[PDB]
Amino acid sequence: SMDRVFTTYKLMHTHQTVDFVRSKHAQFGGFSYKKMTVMEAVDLLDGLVDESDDFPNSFHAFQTAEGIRKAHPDKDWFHLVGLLHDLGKVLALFGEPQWAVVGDTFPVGCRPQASVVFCDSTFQDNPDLQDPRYSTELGMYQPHCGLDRVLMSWGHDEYMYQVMKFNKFSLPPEAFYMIRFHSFYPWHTGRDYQQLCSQQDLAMLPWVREFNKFDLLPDVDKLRPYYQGLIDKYCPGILSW
Ligand SMILES: O=C1[C@@H](O)[C@H](O)[C@@H](O)[C@H](O)[C@@H]1O
Ligand SMILES: [Fe+3]
Ligand SMILES: [Fe+3]
Question: How far is the CA of 156 from the centre of ligand 2 (A)?
């Protein structure tokens, strides 16, 4: 598998510190990079190949949405979750390097656990891992705080979650959560990070695993009007990114 995939994660696991994530929350927390509609966001990602993997990520938006739609035909909000879920990748078009945008996510501020991809080979130069506040199992966290109180590595999950919240998308809470934690492989697949999750995360786990099935070229022009209706329904108009 790619040397580029490995290099993406090496850079990610070096530079994603507590300070770094906090800096990125400040940098993007104003939503003044762009005014654009959801469909513009989808089309912008025509010019993005995901280096943590090939085709444009935009096709993947439709593919995912259509996979969910086949399996859950009467659940329109869930089809849209498919379309929306990787649109935080617009960060890359905003000048962000891909280790700060794509890839599996992991909590910052506590020791990385075994199922964090390339855990053994990629954390050497992370400065946080010699800081006694962050080098331990729990790090800066209290036991069983819940994932919504964890500071995750920064990229397309928290970013899109924040875009949705700011713009007041009218999706159910499960839709927000799926998107926010869909890259958190160590938790939803590795079953790591049990020290941090709560009952609330246990309730959400079946939703995330169900979504992940469809995350893991279509005739996209024919699909546009349907997905436009869903956008009009759940997240209409020019949004702040
Ligand atoms: O959209 C994505 C891609 O970046 C995949 O390569 C990751 O493995 C996944 O964790 C993430 O959700
Ligand atoms: Fe993703
Ligand atoms: Fe995806």
Answer: 7
